[PDB]
């Protein structure tokens, strides 16, 4: 009886709001209500949407009670609920993945092997870790993000990225009480909306390059949105009824271990990722960097680079520990090859070699 009377209320408002004074709401509150009480999401969404019913039915232009109402409804009903992609739980799968995608140091692989070996043994009649979160410390160029992508592929989860070096206040990672448009939920709810399932691998970038410029240190919010026994029943200011971040993976990244917040230093297992050697960088280029440039710039069967030229570029055109400088050098090689191919190729497959690298 309650549901049918609310359905009648829906019908009357969707018949009436066509002539309503405030059109910024778009009179779509009833159209969007098809996920209020025709919802495939749990009781929390239903309770808030019952409360969201109060927030509807007003005007616009400056601090609307209805634009915030429909925005909160969309945020609540677009973040995935009870939908998990089928994850494969294997460590040997990761054994092959960390070989088919990276030359690798063969030292950082085993740390993730340890952590995943823990992750298979999820006991307690549930899934809860109470363990560190794969803090990765090293240069930017080094394949932190690619390591995360490979891990996510190994476990078949949607990898993401949300920078934390651009956060200065406890409002880009937290929310604000839903009463007006102009307030946005934190970057983590952003990432949760980007994915359509409840268990996405998430990365966190440059946590050590974050400061408390404004009033409020984002470190406490970081610790609260991440501690995998209190965040299972967590919302920021923007949301109201708890949303779990327990199933959600959290791998992290930084550059130094000094500016990482002291409260965040709890449940951190440092996985140190050093630079690379010249031979290792040469293999990386000849396997995954130079071919990347080749089919990025459009060189399917156009130019080939001898290993001598690759090592010469590495020993000359980049000294940074990462593989970003080498990547940019090879990309500019691709650009110059794109020209020296665009005024006519002397053959189907031109040849790049160490003799004329300074020409390219």
């Amino acid at each position: 009886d309650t549901n049918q009377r609310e359905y009648y209320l829906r019908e009357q408002m969707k018949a009436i709001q066509k002539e309503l004074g405030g059109e910024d709401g778009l009179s779509d509150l009833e159209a969007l209500r098809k996920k209020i009480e025709e919802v495939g999401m749990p009781e929390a969404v239903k309770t808030k949407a019952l409360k969201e019913l109060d927030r509807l039915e007003r005007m616009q232009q400056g601090s609307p009670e209805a634009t915030v109402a429909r925005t909160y409804l969309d945020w609540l009903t677009e973040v995935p609920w009870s939908k998990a992609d089928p994850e494969v739980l294997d460590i040997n799968h990761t054994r092959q993945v960390l070989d088919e995608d990276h030359y690798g140091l063969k030292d950082v692989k085993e740390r993730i092997l340890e952590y995943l070996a823990v992750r298979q043994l999820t006991q307690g009649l549930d899934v809860r870790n109470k363990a560190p979160i794969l803090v990765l410390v090293g240069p930017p160029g080094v394949g932190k993000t690619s390591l995360g992508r490979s891990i996510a592929r190994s476990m078949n989860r949607k990898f993401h990225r949300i920078s934390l070096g651009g956060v200065r206040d406890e409002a880009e990672i937290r929310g604000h009480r839903r009463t007006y448009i102009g307030a946005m939920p934190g970057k983590l709810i952003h990432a949760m909306k980007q994915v359509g399932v409840i268990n996405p691998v998430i990365l966190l970038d440059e946590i050590d390059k974050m400061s408390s410029d404004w009033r409020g240190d984002p470190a406490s919010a970081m610790l609260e949105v991440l501690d995998p026994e209190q965040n299972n029943t967590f919302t920021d200011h923007y949301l109201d009824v708890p949303y779990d971040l327990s199933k959600v993976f959290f791998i992290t990244t930084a550059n130094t271990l000094q500016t990482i917040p002291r409260p965040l230093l709890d449940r951190m297992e440092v996985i140190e990722i050093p630079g690379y050697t010249n031979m290792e960088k040469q293999a990386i280029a000849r396997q995954y960097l130079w071919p990347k440039q080749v089919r990025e710039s459009g060189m399917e069967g156009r130019i080939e680079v001898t290993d001598a030229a690759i090592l010469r570029v590495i020993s000359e055109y980049t000294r940074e520990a990462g593989v970003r400088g080498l990547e940019r050098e090879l990309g500019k090689i691709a650009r110059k090859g794109a020209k020296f191919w665009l005024e006519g190729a002397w053959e189907g497959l031109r040849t790049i070699d160490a003799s004329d690298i300074p020409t390219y």
Partner: protein
């Protein structure tokens, strides 16, 4: 009965045991009316869907054909043959034989009288009281009194059930669900639930109208 002519019903299914006029405007239905005039004033009424197709179709009909004994058949030159049909009971439709005019064979009435008729009469009295309250309060909602007067003094409980169900206004899917129920008590319970839902909506309307006049 079987292979009897079929007249699609207008905008809703005509429930049995109710004094209702049925419009016949299309010539395809007129031919079936003429053929039904050759079947001893007996028509196996099979209704078509919600907003109708201009011509009867061998796929848009319903699965329940009501057998009606025509009280009178008055003819008009305006373009519509309004027939006054007083039906008996529902019956199932096996399949569809295309026309036009359409044909459909059925069986005996699906209305049955089960055991424990004391509960049947108790539910009949309760539903009669509920519908009397429903109609009496629904004067601002434009419920007629001739509808309330046409349900008093009935012998068959199915007659009372269908007559009250027609006189109460809701969609067509719920009427189809009621006609599907061959149980004598299940139909009464469904009508009671629908009347309760409509009366709750009426109470909400009264409360909001009181709020409106208070605001005035």
């Amino acid at each position: 009965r079987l292979e009897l002519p079929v007249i699609p019903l207008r905008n809703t299914v005509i429930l049995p045991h109710t004094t209702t006029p049925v419009d016949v405007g299309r010539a395809k239905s007129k031919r079936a009316v003429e053929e039904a005039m050759g079947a001893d004033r007996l028509i196996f009424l099979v209704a078509q869907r919600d907003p109708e197709v201009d011509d009867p179709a061998p796929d848009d009909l319903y699965t329940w054909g009501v057998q009606a004994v025509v009280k009178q058949a008055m003819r008009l030159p305006d373009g519509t043959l309004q027939v006054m049909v007083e039906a008996r009971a529902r019956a199932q439709v096996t399949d569809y034989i295309p026309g036009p005019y359409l044909r459909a064979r059925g069986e005996v009435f699906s209305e049955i009288f089960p055991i424990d008729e004391a509960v049947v009469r108790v539910l009949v009295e309760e539903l009669k009281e509920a519908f009397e309250k429903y109609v009496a309060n629904h004067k601002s909602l434009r419920l007629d009194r001739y509808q309330l007067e046409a349900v008093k003094g009935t012998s068959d409980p199915a007659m009372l059930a269908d007559t009250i169900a027609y006189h109460a206004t809701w969609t067509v899917a719920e009427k189809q669900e009621i006609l599907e129920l061959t149980d004598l008590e299940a139909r009464l319970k469904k009508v009671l639930g629908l009347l309760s839902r409509d009366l709750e909506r009426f109470e909400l309307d009264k409360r909001v109208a009181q709020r409106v006049k208070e605001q005035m």
